[PDB]
């Protein structure tokens, strides 16, 4: 006999470009006559729901209000109310979106494969290490020349809470890089996706050669005629 | 009596991040009590523009407003009318503009300064080509410890038309920089702001190291028995 | 009512040497009976000023001053003051056009290694820094020929961030990236007035540029002191 309320968040909004409110009816039976909608912190005319669906399979109903609004809805800060009087409850019931902060940038990182991997000759991992943040909800994606990798390519932690920097969050990601796969050029550029940068975003990347750092034989010769000349 | 109306551009909704409608009422007959409207086609009580501008000293008449929009109005690609008349004109000076869809992504190289301007110990020049890229409207800025440079430590082009592909432009940037900072360290990476990234932001970096390892093969020889060749 | 007149631009100058002044006259009234008449600062009479031009594409007559002088005849301050006399005028319009440093400094960087990789596009860039004063040409030469001016194109000498007053500008050239093989150095001309022989050409080819192989090979020796 509840409603769970739905802000828009990062995911959906840069996921998307179709910033979103939601606030779907649950643990509740196989019902109609029932009305879903949204309002404002002043309370007025939005698109209605869409998506109808079935009833769950465990004796109750389901069913979504969704529509999209103006960033900056969210961005300036206000109350958003989802109204709905239900047929076993008359009474309005009512949910509630709205943001509230300090902020920090992440430091996005990166480190390649370690060599005792590239020994067994199959598989290289690459750990975009992103830290030294806040606010949360970091999206990040993988590019490869311009190119987003899938989501499903690689893996992403949640933003794990900062032991020392107190009030920071980080992440992590992975991308199982077969051995040649990684062997050939293929920067692999690592994307990022919060709030706390000028433009809001950042990438950086890697390759064999990011570091090698000026190998050099140096030869010393004496008493070792070869017929060459110098 | 012409009255100029800038359309939102790229290059200011990042810069600004404020998507703005902006009609400057100039050239018509100095009065004040005027009448000056922001609206959509169907026209609403479309939010009119405050911050006007005061008249021009030199015997002409200045007059400017800001209406701000959500960018995805701009976006649907039907026009937005700045509706202005005059204790004179009856007819409203009617604005209808719209940017026409249809578009190319840019791919920027970044290129650093060659030997000679550093031997000179005074300063030295960085330019990040811009390419490729249609339409026009893109933003440049470079970036340095994760904080934004200021503009006047590094002067940029105009979006000018390229040479042999039509449908493609091309832009610079100019960065002027000591000499001993180029020996330093920081990376001086490059932003950009084009309407066909998928992320819609770019990013590209250099630095001192940024080339290849250049492999030293040193072979001093001391030995007083194999020559030389002239 | 538009009537400029076009001080001398050291491109033609570098181009023939013939300094040259004009003061078109445009969107006057549409009669015929049209004088040209340019003057030096004594007020004395011009050269062959000739090739009378129709009427504009909005129906007015097109004049314009054909004026060629000493490049010497230029340095001191001339008001070249010319009149022109017409039928709407018993007071003709009059004009007048005169003569009003620092030194450039040209590099030519190569293409980036990511440019090299795409495999079409050989960017290449020619350029000028820190001079006074502008009216500076450019141009690209290759093999004592120069290119296709459309296959270049050049900047306008926007002014320095940090310098006083000082000017610069630019200039872009692409080619075959498989021509970036054969090479040439593509030589970039510069050409401002303020240098001794009045042109800093300045070129760059891929064996130009910056190795990543060296080897020096220092040797030692008493059998020396003599540089063969």
């Excluded at 992440?106 to 606010?135: H, K, M, W």
């Excluded at 090698?212 to 060459?228: E, H, I, Q, R, W």
Aim: charged share 20%.
């Amino acid at each position: 006999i509840r409603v769970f309320a739905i802000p828009p968040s990062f995911a959906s909004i840069f996921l998307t470009k179709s910033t979103k409110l939601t606030c779907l009816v649950t643990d509740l039976t196989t019902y109609d006559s029932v009305t879903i909608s949204w309002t404002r912190q002043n309370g007025e005319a939005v698109k209605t729901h869409t998506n109808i669906s079935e009833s769950h399979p465990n004796a109750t109903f389901s069913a979504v209000g969704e529509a999209s609004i103006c960033e900056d809805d969210w961005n300036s800060g206000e109350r958003f109310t989802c109204t709905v009087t239900h047929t076993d409850l008359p009474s309005p019931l009512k949910q509630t979106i709205s943001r509230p902060v300090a902020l920090h940038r992440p430091d996005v990182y990166l480190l390649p494969p370690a060599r005792e991997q590239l020994n067994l000759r199959e598989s290289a991992t690459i750990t975009c290490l992103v830290t030294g943040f806040s606010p949360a909800d970091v999206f990040v994606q993988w590019m490869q020349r311009g190119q987003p990798l899938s989501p499903e390519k690689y893996v992403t932690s949640a933003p794990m809470p900062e032991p020392q920097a107190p009030g920071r969050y980080f992440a992590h990601s992975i991308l199982t890089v077969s051995e040649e796969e990684w062997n050939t050029g293929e920067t692999y550029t690592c994307v990022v996706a919060h709030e706390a940068l000028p433009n809001r975003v950042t990438e950086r990347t890697v390759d064999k050669s990011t570091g090698k750092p000026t190998l050099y034989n140096v030869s010393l010769v004496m008493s070792d005629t070869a017929g060459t000349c110098y």
